[PDB]
């Protein structure tokens, strides 16, 4: 099974670009999850780095739109993004030093993060960003 399945009932924000970027994230996490069941460390690292770069770009996209529109919860929302980015960058520094491995607990963690963040945090910007 794919780790992550996107539906509108679970995750739709009413903001087209954000929904699309979320779908990409889910697909990139699913590839990482599959590779993380192997010992193909170079393929894990390529997919890890591609996912994290995309996630940072998604967060920048949401942040630019929230801040330009004076969205009410912008700074607290960005704080949640920045703590995930710090976790991911720390994981990359360790993984790329040989000091940690990426496995399916890594991808279930990131799944947990997104499945909580999108409904509880991202959906709240829908009225403002869709107006
Ligand atoms: Fe998001
Ligand atoms: Fe977000």
From Swiss-Prot:
Any one GO molecular function term: oxygen carrier activity
Binding site residues for Fe cation 2: 62, 77, 81, 117, 122
Pfam families the UniProt entry points to: Hemerythrin (PF01814)
InterPro entries according to UniProt: Haemerythrin_Fe_BS, Hemerythrin, Hemerythrin-like, Hemerythrin-like_sf, Hemerythrin_metal-bd
Calcium listed as a keyword: no
Residues annotated to bind Fe cation 1: 22, 58, 62, 122
Keyword annotations from UniProtKB, A to Z: Iron, Metal-binding, Oxygen transport, Transport
Quaternary structure, from the entry: Monomer.
Protein family: Belongs to the hemerythrin family.
Function: Oxygen-binding protein. May be involved in a storage mechanism or for delivery to oxygen-requiring enzymes. The oxygen-binding site contains two iron atoms.
Protein name: Bacteriohemerythrin
């Amino acid at each position: 099974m794919a780790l992550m399945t996107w539906t509108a009932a679970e995750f739709g924000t009413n903001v087209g670009f954000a929904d699309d970027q979320h779908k990409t994230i889910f697909d990139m996490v699913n590839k990482l999850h599959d590779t993380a069941a192997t010992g193909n460390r170079s393929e894990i690292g390529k997919q890890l780095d591609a996912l994290i770069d995309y996630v940072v770009m998604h967060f920048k996209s949401e942040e630019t739109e929230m801040q330009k529109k004076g969205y009410a919860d912008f700074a607290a929302h960005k704080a949640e993004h920045d703590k995930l980015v710090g976790v991911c960058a720390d994981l990359q520094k360790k993984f790329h030093a040989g000091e940690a491995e990426v496995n399916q607990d890594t991808t279930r963690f990131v799944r947990d993060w997104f499945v909580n963040h999108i409904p509880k945090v991202d959906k709240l910007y829908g009225p403002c960003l869709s107006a």
